[PDB]
Design a binder for these strands. Sequence first.
DNA 1: CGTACGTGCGTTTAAGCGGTGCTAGAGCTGTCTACGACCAATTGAGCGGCCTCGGCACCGGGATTGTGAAAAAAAAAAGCTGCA
Length: 100
Amino acid sequence: GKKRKRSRKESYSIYVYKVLKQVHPDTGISSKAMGIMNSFVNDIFERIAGEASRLAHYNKRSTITSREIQTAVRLLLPGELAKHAVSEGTKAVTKYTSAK
DNA sequence: CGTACGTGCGTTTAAGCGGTGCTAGAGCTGTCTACGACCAATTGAGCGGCCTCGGCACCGGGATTGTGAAAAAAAAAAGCTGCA
Ligand SMILES: [Ca+2]
């Protein structure tokens, strides 16, 4: 083998895979398709975060809470997508708090 | 070529003005603490490296689809005959 480790490069791909095997267990994903799924996750991270950042800033608050994320989500996603995304985020917070 | 629009009348209507009267609720001050930054030790999830092996890229060949020309079936539209 050869010396010097290539420098770390973060991605979401192991989590895209994991979600992929829930939804379509007998289905894989190409190299460039994963590059797209990455570019997607990063896009929506940025959009949501930015809007929450602004919401917090408008109402004179230092802290982004799950509340901000929800409001941003309601502003950014279309109708049905927002509902489900609001449900799942709520579920996730509810579940996380009670498992402390 | 047909009539949907623009024009210019009168007729009707409620927008706007100025004023008064109430109070929801914006928006502030002060007190308290739960909740997040911070740190340090801990230590597994996630990384880069690497090796298999089955899906996809590609090929050839046959089956199917689809276009288009020119040749039928049919419809149609005029000229010809008789016609109560
Ligand atoms: Ca890997």
